């Protein structure tokens, strides 16, 4: 019941729009009493959307209580005059260091160290494993939706209607064509997306970045699986990319199987990498 939701008036304060417009009306927010920061997603509410939004709050409520998923705090309604429209504020954990895309763009040559890719990939997989256990498909895994805190903690955001978004991280099965008329999301679609996010960390951009989004959407189901440009990478990393990017989702490994991959499993400098990331964040 949305009637139970309070006005954010002396509770949460909006500071500024965060990212740019990558996430839309997502704001850096402040808890008025403690000054503690939060991420505030603002959306207009109509009487028809009352049960369409009730499930999005419930989704955040139920599944964000994992260390690799940005935690739900609460929900508020900023009422409008009788001539509409009400505003719903979804208050979340603030991942102050921004996204993985920001991290790659803020690194010289726009590439990340292989041990940094492995660490962040495992945190993506651990967050996806939690969602998949609960029978939830993220549906939008990409660098922009993988966030960092000040402590180099990796957290997932925006898990799941009018616009088709960016195609570059979309698995072949989610794109409708003549052989695949009913483009379906499988849990394994998040794994393809994870592999594209791993190329994005390695190369600074996803595989068909130079193509018009319409051309990329056409090519993803027809082209062979994308590959890393450089040969500098280890055998373990190419194998992980190959594992994520199995063209036919029916032979693609599960999240549990990818968590057992040597590239994700074998991480000795796990504590060292976390420090290096924290240090890179400190250089704002």
Binding site residues, as ranges? 18-26, 41
Question: Cβ closer to ligand 6HH: 64 or 189?
Answer: 64
How far is residue 14's CA from residue 42's CA, in Å, rounded to a whole number? 10
As given in the structure block, the two tokens for residue 166 are 């960016």
DSSP 92-124: EE--TT-BHHHHHHTSGGG---HHHHHHHHHHH
Q: How far is the CB of 156 from ligand 6HH (least distance, A)?
A: 9
Question: Cβ closer to ligand 6HH: 159 or 249?
Answer: 159
How far is residue 115's CA from residue 19's CA, in Å, rounded to a whole number? 26
How far is residue 192's CA from residue 268's CA, in Å, rounded to a whole number? 26
Q: How far is the CB of 218 from ligand 6HH (least distance, A)?
A: 28
> Counting beta carbons within 10 angstroms of the beta carbon of residue 55, is it exposed (0 to 12), middle (13 to 18) or buried (19 or more)?
exposed
Q: Which residues bind ligand 6HH (CB under 6 A)?
A: 18-19, 23, 26, 39, 41, 70, 92-96, 98-99, 102, 147, 157-158
Residue with tokens 């609960």: 134
- Catalytic site includes residue 44: no
Of residues 40, 46, 47, 1, the one with CA closest to residue 18: 40
Q: How far is the CB of 209 from ligand 6HH (least distance, A)?
A: 20
Of residues 13, 158, 168, the one with CA closest to residue 95: 158
Question: Cβ closer to ligand 6HH: 95 or 154?
Answer: 95
Mode of pairing for the β-strands spanning 37-45 and 72-78 = unpaired
Query: Which of 140, 182, 190, 210 is labelled catalytic?
Result: 140
Q: How far is the CB of 28 from ligand 6HH (least distance, A)?
A: 6
Residue with tokens 């939004």: 53
Which amino acids are annotated catalytic?
Answer: 140
């Amino acid at each position: 019941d949305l009637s139970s939701l309070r006005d954010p008036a002396g509770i949460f304060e909006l500071v500024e729009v965060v990212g740019n417009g990558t996430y839309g009306q997502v704001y850096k927010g402040r808890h008025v009493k403690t000054g503690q920061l939060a991420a505030i997603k603002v959306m207009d509410v109509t009487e028809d959307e009352e049960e369409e939004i009730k499930l999005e709050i419930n989704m955040l409520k139920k599944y964000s209580h994992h260390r690799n998923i940005a935690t739900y705090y609460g929900a508020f309604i900023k009422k409008s005059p009788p001539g509409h429209d009400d505003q719903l504020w979804l208050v979340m954990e603030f991942c102050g260091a921004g996204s993985i895309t920001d991290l790659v763009k803020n690194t010289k040559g726009n590439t990340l160290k292989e041990d940094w890719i492995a660490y962040i990939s495992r945190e993506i997989l651990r967050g996806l494993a939690h969602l998949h256990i609960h029978h939830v498909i993220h549906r939008d895994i990409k660098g922009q939706n993988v966030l960092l805190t000040e402590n180099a903690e990796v957290k997932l955001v925006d898990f799941g209607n009018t616009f088709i978004g960016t195609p570059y991280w979309m698995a072949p099965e989610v794109i409708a064509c003549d052989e695949n008329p009913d483009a379906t999301y499988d849990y394994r679609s998040d794994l393809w997306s994870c592999g594209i996010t791993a190329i994005e960390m390695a190369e600074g951009a996803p595989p068909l970045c130079d193509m018009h989004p319409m051309r990329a959407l056409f090519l993803i189901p027809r082209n062979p699986p994308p590959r890393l440009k450089s040969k500098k990478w280890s055998k373990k990393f190419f194998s992980f990319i190959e594992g994520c990017l199995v063209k036919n989702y029916m032979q693609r490994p599960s999240t549990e199987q990818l968590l057992k991959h040597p590239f994700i499993r074998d991480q000795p400098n796990e504590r060292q990498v976390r420090i290096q990331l924290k240090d890179h964040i400190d250089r704002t």
